[PDB]
Amino acid sequence: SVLTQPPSASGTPGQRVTISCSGSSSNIGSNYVYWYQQLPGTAPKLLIYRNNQRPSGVPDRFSGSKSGTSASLAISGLRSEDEADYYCAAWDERLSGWVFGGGTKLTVLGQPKAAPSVTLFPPSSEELQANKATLVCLISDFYPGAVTVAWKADSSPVKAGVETTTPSKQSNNKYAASSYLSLTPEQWKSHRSYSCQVTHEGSTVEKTVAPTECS
Template identity: 35%
Template sequence: MIILFLCIAFNTILVSGSSLSDQVHQTPPDLFSKQGERAKISCSHSIDNYNRMLWYKQTNRELQFLGNMLARLPTPEKGLDIKLEGSADKGQNCTLTTERLELNSSAVYFCAASYHSPYSTPAYFGQGTKLTVLEPGLNVTAPTVKVLKPCKNQKGNKTLVCVASGFYPDHVSVSWEIDDVVVTKGVATDNAALRNGSYYKITSRLRVTEEVWYTEGKKFHCAVRFYDGTGYIYQNKTIKGKWKVVLTTDQYLWISRAAELSYSVLIVKSCIYGAFVAFLVWKLQGSTGKQDD
């Protein structure tokens, strides 16, 4: 097994995120099964001349090679209770069937399209299938979602926090929208849901400027997508921004200068008015002195 894996590793460059990876189609993206059942995953590609399909199991960021299909010739790894069927040619379906699932069968499974060659050639990954073997006694449970407003004493940029909790299993994803437009800038989501007892929890943070948060009526929307075994359900929460006058540096300097100018004008006016009053008093005193004479 190790020798075969090394041979494939040295003769194949595994690539993800490439434009050709978009031509590798893996289904389903999510899958639940029970212990003792089987799970079937399909993969196809539309890359010219490619005729080999590689299969991997990822657990805790470690890839385990499961086998490969060369055209219609399957070669599963020995000692693994799996079956490869179909064809690895362009436009055909290649399927991986895992028999008699156990709890440790839970993982992310990947297919990768490649070209059979004695030389190094790139292999392009599919998007992966997250398989969970359900634990006995635990029911599939959708998350509860809440959004926490920024702390009042937080200076500068504001951080909104979306918390999804109480769900099982961990087939969940989180996204943010501002005024119905999906945003990714300023978003930080936990790499994986954290388990606490029988259930999971995941947190996502959205960081925005003061100007954005203090815009009356602006909507901040957290959308949590959860796979329940038959389809996807969404739990959504929306909060609105608060109105507050937030000045930019230029605006603050302009207002400060305007205030200084207004204050200076007021002082000048006060001086003029004081001088005018003093002049009137002097005139009145002069007039009174003449009458006395």
């Protein structure tokens, strides 16, 4: 990116947060600045145009300003719905191109802890016919977006065949993750039990499935 922004910003709810954007005489020093807000999974949305003007649906608490070769975005009434990525943009006379800052991920601190829901699925009979076996462990709706997942074959820990995603922010500012255990049908049929074990903020949820059971 040609412009410069901090990669992250923090704020407790209700307080005022500032996001800077540093340029040079070619771009910010000579031209208007525009700000864009991007929610996870969606296209960016115009937030501030011409240094400090607001479009529709952009509330009072969003304000911009430009001084010299530098620009700033200010969010006063900080709500949890403001968690998003913010980008500044401007025309650069020397490059004859639109330039962006690297973007700032805004985090609203102090959100309440939430324990994960955990659903564990055994291999489908159909997958077993194909001589494959995948155990699926789905983990959702947890805050502090950090979990550890451990798998157990009976009582012994199993690390081979484990693939776990990194937690990703859902639409309700909570996090989701999943972990997959790949086995051969023989491994599945031999042990009496397998377990997905999820730890979150010192508390643990453990779901278990067995080959013998079958609803």
